[PDB]
């Protein structure tokens, strides 16, 4: 809330990935560090694009205080972002759900159990169904 100032250095228009990509130089004297949501909001309005098509990351605040250098991308449409962006980023933002699954080794275990069966298997269920008898 002491003005801030959001610079964007080294810019590249990258059409083969539908976006302009650049460094983000954030001065912020008297106000430690900025936030990503504020930054996407603020550059949503310089590239006439809107938030949900701007991605920002990297980021470390300079030693001693009052500056933070990061990196940003702004896409020539929200579709292009939703397809060219890392899915964890889309998660970070609000534009994608983290569909969570079983553990990594839970899954591997599942797979290795599945190896021991040849074919459909319900067939094998009806076959153990008789082992239930004799």
């Amino acid at each position: 809330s002491d003005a801030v100032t959001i610079r964007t250095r080294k810019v590249i228009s990258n059409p083969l990935l539908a976006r302009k990509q650049f460094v983000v130089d954030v001065l912020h004297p008297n106000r430690a560090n900025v936030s990503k949501d504020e930054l996407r909001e603020k550059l949503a309005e310089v590239y006439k694009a809107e938030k949900d098509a701007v991605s920002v990351f990297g980021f470390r605040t300079q030693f001693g205080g009052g500056k933070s250098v990061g990196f940003g991308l702004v896409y020539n449409s929200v579709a292009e972002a939703k397809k060219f962006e890392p899915t964890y980023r889309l998660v970070r933002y609000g534009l994608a759900e983290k569909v969570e699954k079983a553990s990594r080794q839970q899954r591997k275990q599942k797979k290795n159990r599945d190896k021991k069966i040849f074919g459909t298997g319900k067939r094998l269920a009806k076959k153990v169904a008789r082992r239930n008898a004799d």
């Binding site: 004297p29 008297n30 300079q62 030693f63 001693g64 205080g65 009052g66 500056k67």
Partner: protein, 185 residues
Amino acid sequence: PRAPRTYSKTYSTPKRPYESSRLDAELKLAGEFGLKNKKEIYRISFQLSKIRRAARDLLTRDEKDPKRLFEGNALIRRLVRVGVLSEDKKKLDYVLALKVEDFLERRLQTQVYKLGLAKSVHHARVLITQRHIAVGKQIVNIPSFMVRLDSEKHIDFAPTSPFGGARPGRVARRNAARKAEASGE
């Protein structure tokens, strides 16, 4: 299967363990410049030692030999830059001369005191480690910073701490709180 992160050391220790004269000398240095380690001297004698070697080496080469010229000049302008090498004696036989104090005199620890700003090499330390003082807007907290000469003009207290405005910081502020809470309501 990754790459070695390379490293090396930055000091060397005396071949003679107990030599009174050398201990007096060392201590006096540590006392003038406010160091804490015999190592803070060892380090500098080591830096020096390498510099001197390289110097001797180029010096056995021919005058106007390509290496001696490229590397010699580089070595010099590198020394002039920090303020270890006086502009008069900018030709490598004074670098072969040189001596440790010429290095010590250039630490941030010392420059902070030399242009007043501290009035004790110790107050100088305690200042620097405690974050106040900087070069640009860039806070430096390393007594061995080695003031770069064309940044000598740029040693001041930081935009933060007291001493450069911004606050008094909890202890004084604690006291301001004691005043307006005891005396008033």
